[PDB]
Symmetry: D2
Subunit: 261 residues, 4 copies
């Protein structure tokens, strides 16, 4: 079908991209970066996240594939030496699709903005103390004081979430995971401490206590939001679809990245 290729933009990735486009030229395949059905990302996980956000409006019409020009990625999990075999199998089609859960972030003001994250969304203070009330399904759960909070998708769990002590979750689980950044706990201040894992349909809302300005991140994007009344998290109805050409199990990808490769 229609396809496009994004590149990290270094010499290696651009050449690999030109070679695949030449290869695709020998099949019924049209290059179209407006309405692709296949999006190939050549670079690291940073490049793959950008590809995801470039096409987040057509997630259900796109299958993603990632090629790693440097080290193994979690999203960019094919090697370059296999580009030609990838060209071949993508051209024929008939490939299986694999779907991972995504996170919906809603920011309400005194309008409303919604974002989709593939890894995570984080909340930190503008320039002072961070204090927020955490409300779960309309029930007040804790008053959080500390550096910030992180809400991760399952495939996000190997990223920022892991650095904050979160658990690694297989991406077939439709869930989101909330971790703390440097929480204060003394006689007067009290948080759960532990990461929290939420199923689909649960809503976690962060509400300002004093300061209403916050730094909010979604994957790579970080934006100062002013006059915030609420930040809301829930597992998205939308999913990201990967074109699958061979078996590469999530736990093997974890082993290869963290234990040994």
């Amino acid at each position: 079908m229609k396809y496009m290729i994004t590149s990290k933009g270094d010499e290696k990735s651009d050449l690999l991209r030109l070679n695949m486009i030449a290869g695709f030229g020998e099949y019924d395949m049209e290059y179209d970066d407006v309405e692709p059905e296949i999006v190939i990302s050549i670079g690291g996980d940073g490049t793959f996240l950008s590809a995801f956000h470039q096409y987040e409006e057509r997630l259900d019409e796109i299958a993603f594939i990632g090629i790693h020009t440097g080290h193994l990625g979690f999203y960019a999990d094919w090697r370059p030496a296999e580009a030609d075999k990838l060209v071949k199998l993508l051209a024929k089609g008939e490939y299986q699709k694999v779907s991972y859960p995504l996170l919906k972030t809603t920011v309400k003001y005194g309008k409303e903005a919604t974002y989709l994250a593939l890894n995570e969304s984080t909340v930190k203070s503008s320039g002072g103390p961070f204090v927020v009330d955490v409300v779960i399904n309309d029930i007040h759960f804790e008053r959080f004081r500390g550096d910030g909070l992180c809400m991760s998708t399952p495939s996000g769990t190997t990223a920022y979430n892991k650095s904050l002590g979160g658990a690694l979750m297989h991406p077939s689980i439709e869930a989101m995971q909330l971790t703390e950044m440097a929480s204060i706990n003394n006689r007067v201040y009290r948080t759960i401490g532990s990461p929290l894992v939420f199923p689909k349909h649960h809503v976690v809302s962060l509400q300002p206590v004093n300061d209403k300005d916050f730094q909010i991140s979604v994957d790579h994007l970080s934006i100062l939001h002013r006059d915030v009344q609420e930040i809301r998290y829930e597992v998205s109805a939308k999913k990201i679809h990967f074109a699958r050409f061979r078996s590469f199990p999530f736990w093997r990808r974890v082993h290869d990245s963290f234990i040994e490769d």
Copy 2:
């Protein structure tokens, strides 16, 4: 239907148990501790775990309810002052049932024993260094050296799992969670560090490296197993059923036990 009541065995719990049996005497309800359809446990979570293991062969024919004579429990989540209202509503029936996932542990030797856990199963060494190979769905994932490992159900996540840094998981998620106890990590030895969350149908197998004797726990029961060839973990096909009489959400129960009550 037929019901029974277990007691922690202190003065408070026994009296409460005698009072409920007297109350049940005013309805069509037969006391039968052989084939009950309702099992009321009066005591702490320790008492409730024993009630679960007393009837683990008839899980699909029993609905459990727990009354806490001391502090709030996660399983024993009704107060004693409400015993009479509980008598009433249990007698009529028509109550809703709530189901939580369980963990299947299989121990293989050079026969085979299987256990069901409501909280967790743990593995530690007999008397020396603990070294085991962790294999996930037949893929070698890590060689673990340290004090031990813990595999938790979702309702188990607030117990031993929490103490070991694991995440708290809503019990509607069909999953198990593996946490490390004091893992060694240096130049030569390497584990994932992070807790790992597994969906239904994934199989985690622990295999001996040198010593084949291990201390294996399942909830309260701890047994030295000799001549072990494998310990296997998977989400059970079986579930524990709770009689539900009012709303008491899992996250509110977490708040009440860990943040404030």
Copy 3:
């Protein structure tokens, strides 16, 4: 001798301050906020840190005392109801002095600025990834990637340091403690993980890898530093002196703040 009193500036603290000044009026004591020998801080630990930084140039000529108008402080460890007894004993003098270690931070550019911290100094990135080389006594120890680093004095250990997993250290130990904020560790990136405790005379230097802009904090003060070549940490030669009027051991103060009071 000469004394001054700083206030949190709320109604309670100002009144208490006016009452102590009236009380001091009945002894040979002169109010002088230029060259005091006694500095009384009335408020929380935030107020006490400001008092410390107001007089950091005359540390060896000043004995500090803190009164807590709200909850117990670590520095502001006297109750208000005891103000009059404090007036009395401070007036006579002959009190013992207690000394705690401080941290020296040196920031070098392409000039040089030095700061003194009572709690800690932290380093975070301006707006992008944080990557720094950590050099200990001229030996390259690790390349750190993550959110930031924190260097704590012993009395600082109960503050930000504690939130980041650091150990609590008795303040009679002349040392500083380095903790990580959200370090990345995978196949390619590698940090020690654990907090590190350094004795007097050891020098820890942070050196930029790519970006040379950093957010540097010292206690309450947070400043964006541009064109940084090095951040250097060492236990200061200077100490903060407390006027001691009764026994209140550090570990009891830890118990009272974190376990129960």
Copy 4:
């Protein structure tokens, strides 16, 4: 002077030991394993700990040296290829000595036993729940419930202590460090969480609450102690002395073992 050599007992270590004894035969050096002044340990850190405990009664008359036949050790920090140069320099003498702090453990019953640890002493329960009262300098600090507690020397901090989240402390600091093993913290149970670092002269006492049987370890030795009334920890007056032949800084040894070598 008089010297002896202990071996791990594998083929490599025994041969290396025979070669050094032959080499020492060309100098004024007498082999004496009763009253040596130099103790050479050839093997891992396990072998070196045994050498330490073999001669713990003559610590002030002995200088230790460790050769690693396998991977780098923290105590056994010389390579085998340098045995001959070690022979040479040890024979002449005039070498500098380096001293590390040790931990004194006292166990009181309803007599009294004292032990010296080079790494750590740990306390765990015999077979049930572990509950102990932690008393610091006669002040009740916390009631600890969980798996156990670990008290580490500074050179011990890179061992068991590190696995439990403790800080790594330079061995020139005369201190001991207490870490928790799987502490329970809920509404009803409360521990400090954080590792605690104690200076010389502070006394930490563990006192039984219910069960008075405990598994107590000191380095490699693990013993079930019955009828325990108290376990007492303090920095020892005794020190272990190392023969120093070249510079190998503690932090470089940490880097080489944990970051890269």
